[PDB]
Homo-oligomer: A and B are copies of this chain.
Amino acid sequence: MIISTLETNLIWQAALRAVQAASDHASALGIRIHVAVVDRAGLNLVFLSMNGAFLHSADIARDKAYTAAGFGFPTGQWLQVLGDNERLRIGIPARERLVVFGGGLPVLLDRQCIGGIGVSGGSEEQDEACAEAGLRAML
């Protein structure tokens, strides 16, 4: 019988290109960041920490990547997704490693999520811009 399925997954060479571009963008902005790239299962591919970035931002970047890979949409959209539902507004942000502020983006290929990128250390807008620079460098 059939026991397997073929799944698309992000490769480490592309993650490496992405963290190079995200850190270069941070340098161009005058900021210091952490940037994490994870695969489809949420497992590390490349995690880069610039000297002098905020200490807490290490885990935030990892969690942003994990959240974006795990759900397939940008972390900054979470509150919009939760809407007026108080059960979700209380419950979802309380989950371990789930980030609801901006800076995590899914890695989409053929509209299929194959990984995630997360940036922390700047403003939400700066984080997303560095993450987008990483996505563009993957291509």
Residues of A within 8 A of B (CB): 1-17, 19-20, 23, 34, 39-51, 54-56, 58-60, 66-67, 69-72, 76, 78-79, 85-88, 90-102, 107, 109, 114, 124, 138-139
Contacts and interface: CB of A to CB of B under 8 A. Distances in A.
Contacts of A23: 12, 16
Nearest to A15: B48
Number of copies: 8
Contacts of A94: 93-94
A93 B91 contact: yes
Q: What 3 A-B pairs come out closest when comparing CB atoms? A: A55-B70, A41-B41, A3-B14
Contacts of A4: 8-11, 14, 109, 114
Considering residues A39, A55, A67, A100, which has the most beta carbons from chain B within 10 angstroms of its beta carbon?
A55
Given A56-B71, A56-B97, A87-B79, A9 B16 contact: no
Nearest to A47: B47
Nearest to A23: B12
A96 to B, nearest CB: 7
A75 B68 CA distance: 26
Nearest to A100: B91
B91 A101 contact: yes
